[PDB]
Design an enzyme around this catalytic site. Structure first.
Site, PDB file in Angstrom:
ATOM      1  N   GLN F  10      50.090 136.273 -15.532  1.00 31.69           N
ATOM      2  CA  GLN F  10      49.213 136.968 -14.665  1.00 31.69           C
ATOM      3  C   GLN F  10      49.801 137.280 -13.180  1.00 31.69           C
ATOM      4  O   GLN F  10      49.478 138.423 -12.690  1.00 31.69           O
ATOM      5  CB  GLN F  10      47.798 136.364 -14.245  1.00 31.69           C
ATOM      6  CG  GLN F  10      46.809 137.056 -13.460  1.00 31.69           C
ATOM      7  CD  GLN F  10      46.898 136.372 -12.108  1.00 31.69           C
ATOM      8  OE1 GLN F  10      46.898 135.414 -11.905  1.00 31.69           O
ATOM      9  NE2 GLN F  10      47.347 137.538 -11.091  1.00 31.69           N
ATOM     10  N   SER F 114      55.542 132.527 -12.476  1.00 32.13           N
ATOM     11  CA  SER F 114      54.544 131.826 -11.652  1.00 32.13           C
ATOM     12  C   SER F 114      54.979 130.241 -12.400  1.00 32.13           C
ATOM     13  O   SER F 114      54.706 129.887 -13.575  1.00 32.13           O
ATOM     14  CB  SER F 114      53.093 131.829 -11.556  1.00 32.13           C
ATOM     15  OG  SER F 114      52.298 131.499 -12.735  1.00 32.13           O
ATOM     16  N   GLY F 118      50.505 128.126 -17.386  1.00 30.72           N
ATOM     17  CA  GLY F 118      50.765 127.769 -18.590  1.00 30.72           C
ATOM     18  C   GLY F 118      51.740 128.645 -19.301  1.00 30.72           C
ATOM     19  O   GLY F 118      52.803 128.204 -19.551  1.00 30.72           O
ATOM     20  N   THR F 119      51.287 129.857 -19.672  1.00 30.85           N
ATOM     21  CA  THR F 119      52.219 131.018 -20.183  1.00 30.85           C
ATOM     22  C   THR F 119      53.204 131.437 -19.169  1.00 30.85           C
ATOM     23  O   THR F 119      54.441 131.396 -19.440  1.00 30.85           O
ATOM     24  CB  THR F 119      51.338 132.111 -20.438  1.00 30.85           C
ATOM     25  OG1 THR F 119      50.533 131.988 -21.546  1.00 30.85           O
ATOM     26  CG2 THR F 119      52.100 133.347 -20.650  1.00 30.85           C
ATOM     27  N   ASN F 172      52.209 131.413  -1.630  1.00 29.70           N
ATOM     28  CA  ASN F 172      51.313 132.422  -1.285  1.00 29.70           C
ATOM     29  C   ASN F 172      50.501 132.183   0.040  1.00 29.70           C
ATOM     30  O   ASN F 172      50.314 132.918   1.010  1.00 29.70           O
ATOM     31  CB  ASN F 172      50.146 132.543  -2.306  1.00 29.70           C
ATOM     32  CG  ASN F 172      50.646 132.871  -3.703  1.00 29.70           C
ATOM     33  OD1 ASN F 172      51.751 133.496  -3.689  1.00 29.70           O
ATOM     34  ND2 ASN F 172      50.196 132.221  -4.601  1.00 29.70           N
ATOM     35  N   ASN F 194      51.029 140.697  -3.173  1.00 34.99           N
ATOM     36  CA  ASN F 194      52.144 141.121  -3.597  1.00 34.99           C
ATOM     37  C   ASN F 194      52.816 142.455  -3.365  1.00 34.99           C
ATOM     38  O   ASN F 194      53.993 142.937  -3.650  1.00 34.99           O
ATOM     39  CB  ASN F 194      52.052 141.366  -5.104  1.00 34.99           C
ATOM     40  CG  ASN F 194      50.769 142.222  -5.695  1.00 34.99           C
ATOM     41  OD1 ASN F 194      49.669 142.429  -4.761  1.00 34.99           O
ATOM     42  ND2 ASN F 194      51.030 142.900  -6.583  1.00 34.99           N
ATOM     43  N   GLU F 220      76.321 140.660  -7.151  1.00 34.34           N
ATOM     44  CA  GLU F 220      77.082 140.184  -5.970  1.00 34.34           C
ATOM     45  C   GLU F 220      76.583 138.819  -5.359  1.00 34.34           C
ATOM     46  O   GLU F 220      77.194 137.782  -4.822  1.00 34.34           O
ATOM     47  CB  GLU F 220      77.559 141.005  -5.014  1.00 34.34           C
ATOM     48  CG  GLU F 220      78.825 140.612  -4.517  1.00 34.34           C
ATOM     49  CD  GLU F 220      80.152 141.547  -4.990  1.00 34.34           C
ATOM     50  OE1 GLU F 220      80.038 141.804  -6.356  1.00 34.34           O
ATOM     51  OE2 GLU F 220      80.988 141.777  -4.390  1.00 34.34           O
TER      52      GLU F 220
HETATM   53  N1  LIG Z   1      52.059 135.465  -4.731  1.00 34.80           N
HETATM   54  C1  LIG Z   1      51.302 135.917  -5.682  1.00 34.80           C
HETATM   55  N2  LIG Z   1      50.969 135.019  -6.452  1.00 34.80           N
HETATM   56  C2  LIG Z   1      50.302 135.294  -7.333  1.00 34.80           C
HETATM   57  C3  LIG Z   1      49.840 136.578  -7.965  1.00 34.80           C
HETATM   58  N3  LIG Z   1      49.223 136.447  -9.019  1.00 34.80           N
HETATM   59  C4  LIG Z   1      48.770 135.377  -9.442  1.00 34.80           C
HETATM   60  N4  LIG Z   1      49.608 134.341  -8.184  1.00 34.80           N
HETATM   61  C5  LIG Z   1      49.389 132.988  -8.477  1.00 34.80           C
HETATM   62  O1  LIG Z   1      49.826 132.469  -9.772  1.00 34.80           O
HETATM   63  C6  LIG Z   1      48.779 131.779 -10.323  1.00 34.80           C
HETATM   64  C7  LIG Z   1      48.639 132.569 -11.738  1.00 34.80           C
HETATM   65  O2  LIG Z   1      47.658 132.184 -12.577  1.00 34.80           O
HETATM   66  P1  LIG Z   1      48.075 131.084 -13.889  1.00 34.80           P
HETATM   67  O3  LIG Z   1      48.640 129.741 -13.050  1.00 34.80           O
HETATM   68  O4  LIG Z   1      48.907 131.765 -14.563  1.00 34.80           O
HETATM   69  O5  LIG Z   1      46.671 130.631 -14.421  1.00 34.80           O
HETATM   70  P2  LIG Z   1      46.179 131.397 -15.861  1.00 34.80           P
HETATM   71  O6  LIG Z   1      45.820 132.899 -15.371  1.00 34.80           O
HETATM   72  O7  LIG Z   1      44.665 130.905 -16.194  1.00 34.80           O
HETATM   73  O8  LIG Z   1      47.168 131.256 -16.911  1.00 34.80           O
HETATM   74  P3  LIG Z   1      46.888 130.126 -17.814  1.00 34.80           P
HETATM   75  O9  LIG Z   1      46.463 128.454 -17.168  1.00 34.80           O
HETATM   76  O10 LIG Z   1      48.066 129.427 -18.653  1.00 34.80           O
HETATM   77  O11 LIG Z   1      45.920 130.265 -18.895  1.00 34.80           O
HETATM   78  C8  LIG Z   1      47.591 132.064  -9.608  1.00 34.80           C
HETATM   79  O12 LIG Z   1      46.984 130.876  -9.712  1.00 34.80           O
HETATM   80  C9  LIG Z   1      48.164 132.556  -8.340  1.00 34.80           C
HETATM   81  O13 LIG Z   1      47.985 131.387  -7.233  1.00 34.80           O
HETATM   82  C10 LIG Z   1      50.455 137.555  -7.046  1.00 34.80           C
HETATM   83  O14 LIG Z   1      50.261 138.903  -7.498  1.00 34.80           O
HETATM   84  N5  LIG Z   1      51.087 137.336  -5.765  1.00 34.80           N
HETATM   85 MG   LIG Z   2      49.316 130.952 -16.492  1.00 31.93          MG
END
Ligand SMILES: Nc1nc2c(ncn2[C@@H]2O[C@H](COP(=O)(O)OP(=O)(O)OP(=O)(O)O)[C@@H](O)[C@H]2O)c(=O)[nH]1
Ligand SMILES: [Mg+2]
Ligand SMILES: Nc1nc2c(ncn2[C@@H]2O[C@H](COP(=O)(O)OP(=O)(O)OP(=O)(O)O)[C@@H](O)[C@H]2O)c(=O)[nH]1
Ligand SMILES: Nc1nc2c(ncn2[C@@H]2O[C@H](COP(=O)(O)OP(=O)(O)O)[C@@H](O)[C@H]2O)c(=O)[nH]1
Ligand SMILES: Nc1nc2c(ncn2[C@@H]2O[C@H](COP(=O)(O)OP(=O)(O)O)[C@@H](O)[C@H]2O)c(=O)[nH]1
Ligand SMILES: [Mg+2]
Lengths: 437, 153, 89, 426, 426, 380
Positions: F10, F114, F118-119, F172, F194, F220
């Site tokens: 995500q 990230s 999980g994914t 973040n 982002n 580089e």
């Molecule tokens: N800096 C930044 N961080 C992000 C952004 N989008 C998501 N994140 C962070 O990355 C994490 C992404 O969500 P996930 O940890 O994958 O949780 P999830 O979507 O439920 O995925 P699963 O737990 O595997 O089902 C979030 O908790 C955010 O803190 C972004 O656009 N910019």
């Molecule tokens: Mg995830």
């Protein structure tokens, strides 16, 4: 060349509010903040370089600090007419006052914003290439004008050091008073700045009310009337850095011409053409008359009589059309009057600087439009009796230990008041240590 | 004689008649086509000219070309004897003076107009443009219309 | 060699003095402008000039900030503060 | 053939040189652009003693303009004759000096003296046969006393043989313009006497009383002051530039005033000074010029010469003249003023005649005089040093650059030795 | 008849070619379409040294520009003179050089340097008597030090006796531009020093400072950095194409300059460097060129000969001039400043006078000189290489490219012996 | 020339949204795809005219049916360590080989993810060792995102650390507190948090994007800022960020636009390198940047003892110049500035953040991270 000035307290930022319009009027820099495209001034091309910064888009941003911890006046300053000229981050805003306490602004409410103010001043100074020194705009009888200014002064020497620190200070009036605890936070803020200040100018409240009453004709005036006059004298003290003339004085020349010692550095300030338009053209403002006017005691901006003291140094900073003959002719008969007493170790006693720029007037303001101007920086030993009264009030009130519980509850130690009193006792003793013939 | 200065100072304190000028120079070996900015001061009939440096910084920057006194029209004069440039002669003294009774040309605003070439101490500079304040001043004072820009640089 | 240098310099100085005399004659020739509309009426339209283009000179009125305009950084009481405060007003 | 390198230090020296280089521009017919606009061929013939010839027919003055701060460089460059000096002859710092000695001598002058030597020795390398060094500076300044006197120290350690004359500006007796003039003056006198072959001292009081008494100006601007001194410097170097009946270069005077290496303090003058209203009602001859040279009320430099005793007199006449009147009037000014000359020299007055007077005059001349009445000039400065050093007035900001008090007492002792050496001829 | 085959290495070489073949195009008077436009005909005579002539009146430069990245090549064709270069001579890579000189010849550069052997010995055989090759690269990059150094090394087998040349961009002293300069610059000196005999020394800040103070541009760019190296780049080979009264090739400048094949590192300069606002104040004479050549502010290298001693000097002049004054000033500089000159050699300096000045000028000179003061450069880079190699920091790449730790000690030892060779003549 | 972009989770799809907004808005890419030679390194040349993006999205995936439905190829956009990767990783490799077969030369391989997903972390820790067995020693990039302290973290450090050339550290909360003292984005959102890292990913590929004077490519900085083949986890800051009005008030010149990177108030992560050591640096410039003023700015920093360099890096600096100013997104928050500076640096000051992670967590990942701590202490 560059210059950076610092306004501390609501006194300082109100001085900036009613003084920086004259900085915008010496050049043609608009309240919007640009050079007007069809009307021009004709003051060279770099006379604005010292007090305003140039941006490639065309707009002009000043080089100053308005810092206050209580919002009600700095918020007016930004929300007022010059809402776009001032840099937003150059106007430091707090969230709580000092309530006439030196201790809070020096330790407790001080330290969490002094780092950001130091960041702003460091960025602004590193922008400048030929920075000449600092000018200080703060009060004594307040809390945030004393404590925060003292902490900034004690933090300035650690970083840069040898750069000159000039002081423009507001002192309690001898007859009338605003607050009740002003000797305390006065001698608490002259205790630590004494080793850091270089030439501390002095401004009184009632002593300029007399000027605005008898020379200028205003009954029941307010702070802005005297603030414009203060703005006029501080702009005339920096007149020769920005414009050209025969004899030139910069910020490194006042120190070498006014104070002989590090312990006696408290001169007096006087501005001579203080007449309005109703009487400016009914008498001839000759150079002899405006030179004779500065040495009259009634023209002084500090409530003291200089005839009871001995003159130590003077610094003429003339303006407009000035014939160098009549300057010498007036100073030569200045030495002829025996009623003006002189000390023996300063045989010269005068520094003269000439500028070829007339004293401007705010249009429709208070003062007149004239051709000549005098900036008197009279260093004399008559400032001691302005300090003996404050010391007398301190001695009378400290014997009952009034209001000390306010200070000691915020980082103070009760023994520090005695140290400040002994430091001022030395600052009183060295004035008669040079009174020997 | 009208030797007072407060007339032209009070009523003409902050009025500056700007003129954009160009000094062509191909006759000399290393002269450049340097354009200039003119400032006529109605406060005391004085005149200063300013330089604008082009891109890539061809020359040094001084921000001033000529200072705050009056421009001679008939070229560069040889410098006079000392005391010859006084505005009023005086009999033999008495520290006071007793003035005489029984006893020099400069550019003024009536000579500067769009299309003329003037003598800044020998140079062939040419007035090309003005600002809108100068257009208004000439429109009222001298009835001049059609302040057409001269195409240069 | 020397004769050529001297003759070139003599011709050079003579030409330069010739152009300078021609410039002096041209300045002696060029016409002057005489005033139409008197002194007492040019100052009036200059007075009107300074009151409809640049009103800030000779005013010092210090008008208040209008209410349809967003505040400088912040004094209290998404997007940036300009756009957010424009939405707020 | 004998070319002169001019030194221009400070704010004072900058203005003085900026207008001396225009009274020497109209003599040689140099326009503001830089081309020869002359009237005859005499100036073209030997225009090398002050000017350098550039590749495009332009003429370039050969002088070094030095000051710490650039607020005075924008005034000399913007003048009427400001666009003929080189871009590289404006050497500058970033800060100022400001009425101090140590800031221009040890802790900041040493950085930029190496930047002025690189153009001074370049300038001498283009010279064919150098004669000496003229310097314009102020004794009561910060850059003239600070940096210019460093240059007096530094150049003659490389060229010891060449001549040295300074046009120095002493503090005024009645009204002065800086509270710490005597400190700088006492510190500069000692290094002046040990290093300069001759000294031309000017005071603004003695210019101002001339512009009041003789020139009769009402509002004497500072250019009216500096014109008298610029004419003085142009009138002591007459014979190098123009032919004449009896020509004298700077070495020919320096062999003729000084008998002792520490008696080299002078008293300049200028003969043809008339008012505006009295120009055409005064006969301009040799008797009425020599009646203006040898008077005190019409005299340049400083103190009253009647309270002392002359040792020597120089006089550089310009113009077609009869030498018999010259000799007769000099003999009569020796004979009638017998009480005001030494008895141990037979002839004290030098005679030098060039053929060309300046523009607007038929004959002109320049007075130069060594006398023991210059003892009074340093008496008041020594009195001020004694009256202010007792309280140690400004002493701590000279020690703020690492300097001690021993050199201050050394300077006072050298001044006392000099002022007692002149005394034994009364 | 004496043709020059030109090889440029890296984006540095391409973009110094983009201005050298602007200076050559202006001095031989050709246009961006390749044909002739110039005023005179003697420029068209010896065009064959640089420009290959094709049918249809076209002058292709004999320039082969090599690089590992095609975008700088497309930028080269995007310039004002991007048309006159042939498209076939551009050698293009696929992968980057990685700020290392390994993969520009080992992995991807093998087939690519096989490809340039179809442009090196193709363009050579079209000539008649090939005078020599020359190169300009950078020691702070990978592809210039990869392909350029090995093409220096590889070309020695086919044509040994023909003179080779290189202009070395040594790394910047104060502000370094790449951290691999301790490796990628020092690794091209231990064995790629015997292959070359005419190594010059051009430094990035050594153009910066002189462009600041001499030319006086507030905003300098690389467009004049390339001009200042290109003026020397063509002024070394002026007598080859232009007849004169003392003709002397680059082989002349090799023979009369170095005593030993190891001691061949130079230190160039270029004398007419006047500010645009200081053109009208400088008398462009013969002594003012040799004055400026012997100064540190007109030195196109990092080091300073005041710390060292002049071994041999070279000077190649232009313009119809008289050779009494150059020899007069030349005898002047050997005698006055005799401390900065090396004994055991009678005369140290070579002159070469041709007839044709560059357009818009009348007289100029080109500087070539070795010294013992260039020891300051190699020691300052060797201390930084030895301050980091002892921690074994960057070896992980070099383990994976077939280079082991023997040649590292070989590089340090060759640096040590070339340094110790340069100490005896101190 | 052809670059690629892979984004995981995500977080990956959300940052790819703004990053490809920047990429499509520098060029004349309107959300249909057509035009009204700088485009080929991220887009194809289809004869119909619709430029296919060179991007793979693995996983909110709003982006499917929002403003840009037809710009993204739906076959390239695909819909987490041992179960789900068996039917996606071998399937997205098919699409990677499909896009790589048409490119003349691939040089960039850019993977975003990230740590907390999980994914997001599982496919991050699957794709790079599947990358190793099909593509080999070609360069790969990782600009990781993991939340800051005080507001699967170690499960991926034992498999990605050794097999990664570069790895940034984007936090973040560390951008959350970096604007409120500089900008006035009160309550910053997430769909445009982002946007700043979109500006940084624009700046890192600037020479691949635009022509330059002294420009340097993607391969580089993974061969310049890396001392050791197992440890190279640098940081990246983009300090010169302001709105339009502060871009109007203060004058922006090259000298005082680089000092903000060296100061901790705009340092992108919270851990200030006063404790740490400046190992080396990387100047990525853009706009009206002159080669003179930069070399008049690093020299002032170099003679300052407030900063502390490591002993073995005497040079420690790296320079790359790009012509164009950054492109300002309508509906964004950037100012139309004329100059900007991008920072890349590795410090020893990351090690104390990871010791904070150590005692917050407190089996093979544990001992490997303890040994990494010891090695990072011994190196600096
Ligand atoms: N800096 C930044 N961080 C992000 C952004 N989008 C998501 N994140 C962070 O990355 C994490 C992404 O969500 P996930 O940890 O994958 O949780 P999830 O979507 O439920 O995925 P699963 O737990 O595997 O089902 C979030 O908790 C955010 O803190 C972004 O656009 N910019
Ligand atoms: Mg995830
Ligand atoms: N002469 C002069 N004095 C002023 C002016 N403005 C404020 N003052 C001084 O300010 C004093 C009043 O105390 P303040 O300065 O308001 O106290 P403060 O700085 O706000 O400190 P706190 O009240 O503790 O926050 C008066 O005694 C005045 O002397 C001014 O415009 N002119
Ligand atoms: N004769 C002469 N005296 C000058 C001139 N300019 C300044 N002065 C005198 O020099 C003194 C001040 O010198 P100062 O400003 O300190 O010179 P600085 O050291 O360059 O700053 C004053 O007493 C003036 O009277 C000048 O042009 N000519
Ligand atoms: N002296 C000089 N240096 C240059 C020029 N062009 C580029 N450089 C320098 O080349 C260095 C980096 O270029 P480099 O990495 O070698 O390019 P490469 O050859 O493709 O590897 C920088 O430090 C630049 O300062 C030039 O024209 N002159
Ligand atoms: Mg307050």
């Amino acid at each position: 060349r560059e210059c950076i000035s610092i306004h501390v307290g609501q006194a300082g930022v109100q001085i900036g509010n009613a003084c920086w319009e004259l900085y915008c009027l010496e050049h043609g820099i608009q309240p919007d903040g640009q050079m007007p495209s069809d009307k021009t001034i004709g003051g060279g091309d770099d006379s604005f370089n010292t007090f305003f910064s140039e941006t490639g888009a065309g707009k002009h941003v000043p080089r100053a600090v308005f810092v206050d911890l209580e919002p009600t006046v700095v918020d007016e300053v930004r929300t007022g007419t010059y809402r776009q000229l001032f840099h937003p981050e150059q106007l430091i805003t707090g969230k709580e006052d000092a309530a006439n306490n030196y201790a809070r602004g020096h330790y407790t409410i001080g330290k969490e914003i002094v780092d950001l103010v130091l960041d702003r001043i460091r960025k602004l100074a590193d922008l400048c290439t030929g920075l000449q020194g600092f000018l200080i705009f703060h009060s004594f009888g307040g809390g945030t004008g004393s404590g925060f200014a003292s902490l900034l002064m004690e933090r300035l020497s650690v970083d840069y050091g040898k750069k000159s620190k000039l002081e423009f200070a507001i002192y309690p009036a001898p007859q009338v008073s605003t607050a009740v605890v002003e000797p305390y936070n006065s001698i608490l803020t002259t205790h630590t700045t004494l080793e850091h200040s270089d030439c501390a100018f002095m401004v009184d409240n009632e002593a300029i009310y007399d000027i605005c009453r008898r020379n200028l004709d205003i009954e029941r005036p307010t702070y802005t009337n005297l603030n414009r006059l203060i703005g006029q004298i501080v702009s005339s003290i920096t007149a020769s850095l920005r414009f050209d003339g025969a004899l030139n004085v910069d910020l490194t020349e006042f120190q070498t011409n006014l104070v002989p010692y590090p312990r006696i550095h408290f001169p007096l300030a006087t501005y001579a053409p203080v007449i309005s338009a109703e009487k400016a053209y009914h008498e001839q403002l000759s150079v002899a008359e405006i030179t004779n006017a500065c040495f009259e005691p009634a023209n002084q901006m500090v409530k003291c009589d200089p005839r009871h003291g001995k003159y130590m140094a003077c610094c003429m900073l003339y303006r407009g059309d000035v014939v160098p003959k009549d300057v010498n002719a007036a100073i030569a008969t200045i030495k002829t009057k025996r009623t003006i007493q002189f000390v023996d170790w300063c045989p010269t006693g005068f520094k003269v600087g000439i500028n070829y720029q007339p004293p401007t007037v705010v249009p429709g303001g208070d003062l007149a439009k004239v051709q000549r101007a005098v900036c008197m920086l009279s260093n004399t030993t008559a400032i001691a009796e302005a300090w003996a009264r404050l010391d007398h009030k301190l001695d009378l009130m400290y014997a009952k230990r009034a209001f000390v519980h306010w200070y000691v509850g915020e980082g103070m130690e009760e023994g520090e008041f005695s140290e400040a009193r002994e430091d001022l006792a030395a600052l009183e003793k060295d004035y008669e240590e040079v009174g020997v013939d | 004689e009208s030797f007072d200065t407060l007339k032209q100072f009070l009523e003409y304190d902050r009025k500056v008649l700007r003129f954009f000028c160009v000094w062509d120079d191909s006759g000399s070996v290393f002269g450049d086509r340097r354009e200039l900015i003119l400032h006529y001061f109605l406060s005391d009939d004085t005149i200063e000219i300013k330089e604008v440096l082009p891109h890539n910084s061809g020359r040094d920057a001084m921000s001033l070309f000529l200072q705050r006194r009056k421009l001679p029209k008939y070229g560069p004069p040889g410098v006079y004897q000392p005391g010859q440039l006084t505005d009023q002669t005086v009999l033999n003294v008495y520290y006071g003076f007793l003035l005489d009774k029984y006893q020099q040309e400069f550019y003024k605003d009536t000579d500067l107009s769009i299309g003329t070439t003037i003598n800044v101490w020998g140079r062939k500079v040419l007035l090309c443009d003005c600002d809108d304040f100068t257009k208004t001043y000439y429109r009222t004072k001298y009835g001049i219309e059609n302040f057409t820009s001269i195409p240069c640089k | 060699n020397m004769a050529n240098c001297l003759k070139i310099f003599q011709e050079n100085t003579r030409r330069c003095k010739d152009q300078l005399e021609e410039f002096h004659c041209s300045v002696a020739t060029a016409p002057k402008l005489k005033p139409v509309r008197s002194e007492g009426t040019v100052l009036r339209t200059l007075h009107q000039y300074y009151r409809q283009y640049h009103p800030l000179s000779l005013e010092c009125k210090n008008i208040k900030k209008p209410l349809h305009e967003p505040p400088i950084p912040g004094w209290a009481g998404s997007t940036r503060y300009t756009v957010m405060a424009r939405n707020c007003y | 053939m004998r070319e002169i390198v001019h030194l221009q230090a400070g704010q004072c020296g900058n203005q003085i040189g900026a207008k001396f280089w225009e009274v020497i521009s109209d003599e040689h017919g140099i326009d503001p652009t830089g081309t020869y606009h002359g009237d005859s061929d005499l100036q073209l013939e030997r225009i090398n003693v002050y000017y350098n010839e550039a590749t495009g027919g332009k003429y370039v003055p050969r002088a070094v303009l030095v000051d710490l701060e650039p607020g005075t460089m924008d005034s000399v460059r913007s003048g009427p004759f400001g666009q003929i000096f080189r871009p590289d002859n404006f050497v500058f710092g970033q800060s100022g000096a400001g009425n101090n000695w140590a800031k221009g001598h040890y802790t900041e002058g040493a950085e930029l003296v190496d930047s002025v030597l690189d153009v001074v020795r370049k300038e001498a390398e283009s010279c064919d046969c150098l004669q000496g060094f003229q310097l314009t500076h102020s004794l009561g300044g910060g850059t003239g006393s600070g940096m210019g006197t460093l240059l007096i120290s530094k150049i003659r350690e490389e060229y010891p043989d060449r001549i040295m004359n300074t046009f120095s500006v002493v503090p005024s007796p009645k009204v002065s313009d800086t509270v710490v003039e005597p400190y700088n003056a006492t510190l500069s006198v000692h290094q002046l006497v040990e290093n300069t072959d001759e000294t031309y001292c000017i005071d603004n009081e003695a210019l101002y009383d001339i512009c009041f008494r003789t020139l009769k100006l009402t509002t004497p601007t500072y250019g009216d002051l500096n014109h008298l001194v610029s004419a003085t410097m142009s009138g002591v170097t007459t014979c190098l530039r123009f032919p004449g009946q009896l020509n004298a270069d700077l070495r020919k005077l320096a062999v003729n005033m000084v008998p002792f290496p520490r008696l080299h303090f002078f008293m300049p003058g200028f003969a043809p000074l008339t008012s505006r209203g009295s120009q055409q009602y005064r006969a301009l001859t040799v008797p009425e010029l020599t009646q203006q040279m040898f008077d005190a009320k019409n005299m340049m430099a400083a103190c009253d010469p009647r309270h002392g005793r002359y040792l020597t007199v120089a006089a550089v006449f310009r113009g077609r003249m009869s030498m018999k009147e010259v000799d007769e009037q000099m003999l009569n000014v020796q004979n009638k003023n017998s009480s005001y000359f030494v008895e141990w020299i037979p002839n004290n007055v030098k005679t030098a005649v060039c053929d060309i007077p300046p523009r607007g005059l038929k004959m002109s001349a320049t007075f130069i005089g060594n006398s023991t009445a210059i003892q009074e000039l340093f008496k008041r400065i020594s009195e001020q040093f004694t009256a202010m050093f007792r309280r140690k007035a400004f002493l701590h900001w000279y020690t703020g650059e690492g300097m001690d008090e021993m050199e201050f007492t050394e300077a006072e002792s050298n001044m006392n030795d000099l002022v007692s050496e002149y005394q034994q001829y009364q």
